[PDB]
Amino acid sequence: LQYPSDLSASVFTTWLEGDTVPNVNYLAEVLDHILMKGNTFTASTGILQNQLVSIFRFVGCYVRENVKFIGNTVRVNTILNRDVSTGTTNDYFKGWVVTGNNYDFSMFRNQRHGLWIFLEYISGCVFDFNIKSRFPTLDKTYNLVNFVLRDKSKVVDNTINIDPNGSYAVLDSWLGGDFLTYTATDMGGRNNHIQSVAFVYINETRRKDSVFAKMGVQSGSIPPSVNMCSVIEYTNVMLGTVSYPVGFNKDYSAAYKLTATAIASQPFLDDETSDRFAYVHFKC
């Protein structure tokens, strides 16, 4: 035995028996489920420091269908470790379920996406991450989940739901990748639904002699398909005399993604703009 060049650990791993078949990157079809439920997965302090410790690892192959990770207690430092090509029109996820897990991400790897994969599509998937964890000080530019999906016409029936609870500020955009570009045709038109959290610019404009402050959310992190957002935290002290909205609706003008109107106690003395920054929970 060679001393292992890769001492990565994972809850779940795919490995290939015998010869590679060119362009056939996936393993034997799962017809109902690989159902991982109710387990306790605890990584040692020392392995969390020294290795990648994933939920899913793909070693020269992966499984397309029906992986179900439900109701587990998990201490790990990343979600997906992949060493596989998934470059073909036959590479997809179908029917994955991730939900109801309890995460300790207190030693989450810095400068690493949780789950970042390039597929043809994902279909009939549920990726529900409800996190109540400490985190280390991460670079805030990486994503928990990032799907690059080459054929949006085949991206159907998916739910992505990321709820970082009190950890909302750890990453600027919990969700990265192609879902961020989906229009109504691509998102609800194909039964795709997203709930996620992002740090956003809000334009606040006030007119002389008005009591209204028009508030406009602008962010490449919110898909143009967004229906609404709820405010988690306005990061700035704002006007004392103003009742600020806590929900935003879709901006039908498309000037912004989302728009609401705050109301003043007394009219504004002059025309002014404010640059605001908020953490929002959005739904498409």
Next chain:
Amino acid sequence: LQYPSDLSASVFTTWLEGDTVPNVNYLAEVLDHILMKGNTFTASTGILQNQLVSIFRFVGCYVRENVKFIGNTVRVNTILNRDVSTGTTNDYFKGWVVTGNNYDFSMFRNQRHGLWIFLEYISGCVFDFNIKSRFPTLDKTYNLVNFVLRDKSKVVDNTINIDPNGSYAVLDSWLGGDFLTYTATDMGGRNNHIQSVAFVYINETRRKDSVFAKMGVQSGSIPPSVNMCSVIEYTNVMLGTVSYPVGFNKDYSAAYKLTATAIASQPFLDDETSDRFAYVHFKC
């Protein structure tokens, strides 16, 4: 053995040993629970196509008390299959708990209510359906849950919570039946609480020279006891210059169930009405 006339399948079934007793439709009392927890219930494709596959089936009898269905993974095509009379003042559910289940309703029966029963009342029940599933193309006029309850004075201490997540549009009214008629006296007055989803008409009225668009929810699917609703989806493109509410409060005038006010950037040029349609999440 006769070839079975009814090849219905169910997770849970009630059957009667020996003679019927007239007007005694229920089986022996459950004092704490029949607790079904943590199971995996997978129906074959072929049985889902060819039979009713229920969670609960009542064959010439039923159980009134303390059925607990918690934390199961379930593939079925209906919730309740009943072949029982429950016509007496002694027919009720008491202390049922349905919550935390993971549903595959991708072969849900068309033109069939999930759970439709006529009882004297239900008491101290929790019916919490959090669904993340594909569905087939259903007739949108049927209900997931429909309780007909003959004595509202005995309907106490109940919670019904239906969260269809991204599937909100599959049925016009997730909840049907007598709870839709409950006033404040019948609902919070007896410690009944409802959270459900429905497709609703919203009246939008705008006055010449006003910046306000009065929005009024009208629907036989919302009980008059409604406290509030959150908007899941406005189905229409609406005014570009308007900040539309995402929450509605109870309309104290009772002109509508629920009312909110949208705010324009510029006043309206004339008096106009718009017929709007939205999916709402409501709470009583």
